[PDB]
Design a binder for this molecule. Sequence first.
Ligand code: C2E
Ligand code: CA
Ligand code: CA
Lengths: 193, 193
Amino acid sequence: GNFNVAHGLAWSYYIGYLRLILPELQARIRTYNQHYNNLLRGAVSQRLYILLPLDCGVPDNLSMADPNIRFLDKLPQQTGDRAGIKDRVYSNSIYELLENGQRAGTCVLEYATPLQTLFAMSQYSQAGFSREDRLEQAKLFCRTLEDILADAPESQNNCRLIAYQEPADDSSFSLSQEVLRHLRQEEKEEVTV
Amino acid sequence: GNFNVAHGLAWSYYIGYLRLILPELQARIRTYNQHYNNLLRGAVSQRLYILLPLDCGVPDNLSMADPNIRFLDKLPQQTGDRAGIKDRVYSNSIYELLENGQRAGTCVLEYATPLQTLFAMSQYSQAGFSREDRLEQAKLFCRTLEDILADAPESQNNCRLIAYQEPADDSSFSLSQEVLRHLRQEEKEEVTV
Ligand SMILES: Nc1nc2c(ncn2[C@@H]2O[C@@H]3COP(=O)(O)O[C@H]4[C@@H](O)[C@H](n5cnc6c(=O)[nH]c(N)nc65)O[C@@H]4COP(=O)(O)O[C@H]3[C@H]2O)c(=O)[nH]1
Ligand SMILES: [Ca+2]
Ligand SMILES: [Ca+2]
């Protein structure tokens, strides 16, 4: 019946994590851009880019997904407040996106960790949760998280969801291209509006 | 038609937390009890006690809801793995339960963290989530988690849910006394079985 784990997962992810880290993340990115743009020959986008593989495949490191997605630098932390903000642990990692060995873009990137739960659920037989259930909830997770972020206080502008199914043959899918296409569209939006 | 956050919250709580902390819990408690017995003739119960206040009120200090519930120690981490078998580092607290100033029991005690999500949602206006909704979802949370632990590999024997609805009239609920009942029933079971 009407059992959708994705509903709770998306709400939990926003309330217990994204809501808490997005303002501080944008603040650190801005500062980083101020001190290091001369060094970067560009700018890190201020949107957290969230990877949502619909196959729920989350690797411990990003480069084993795509050798054109490569660690660049660390985002410095917040400054000497320590007044209640430091609860979650999130990635201070900036990635560069490569095209032909050349840096084509830069962003803060991370996977949507609740997809791990759906994967775990699908390997846990007592849950009675099929691969087909997993994909269905993964999609529902995306839709739900999207709706939440649409009405969220300036957080729609604070992150970008990158949902993607991967070729059920084996074409060499390019995640780096997927991300770059969003980066280019974002800069285009930022500049034509 | 049915949006039930509690479903995903309970699955997320078992998958992302209980499944990982519980298999090694009783070993951690056992090695603490060796010292606890030798040093104070103490015995800490072997089950994780999970407070589920139906009103979703989670304080950042247990002792603030009851000074008959007195902090004793952190439960020390496991051994062998440099990685941790299943854990990075789980903070778990051991508490003494007091009756008329006297130590009457000892257990690893903590609130069900997903109740905070339910509480935050009910203060988040974009959620259209009322305090009546929260309670119904809190009940569903307990029910769902219970069903999960019942099918779960020995994790059911590893923990005990303490779900309580507090009297609206600001009557004299004793949380310490509620916990002691469970502790006294646990000892009765282990001693009769
Ligand atoms: N990248 C990143 N993502 C984060 C972080 N914190 C939370 N998230 C994401 O948001 C989800 C919801 O977290 P939650 O509301 O704290 O909800 C948690 C919480 O209620 C509970 N839980 C998890 N770890 C602990 C713990 O160490 N102690 C206790 N008492 N509860 C825990 O189980 C729920 C499910 O946890 P998850 O499966 O891990 O699911 C997490 C996770 O996917 C973070 O610091 N970094
Ligand atoms: Ca993949
Ligand atoms: Ca209460």
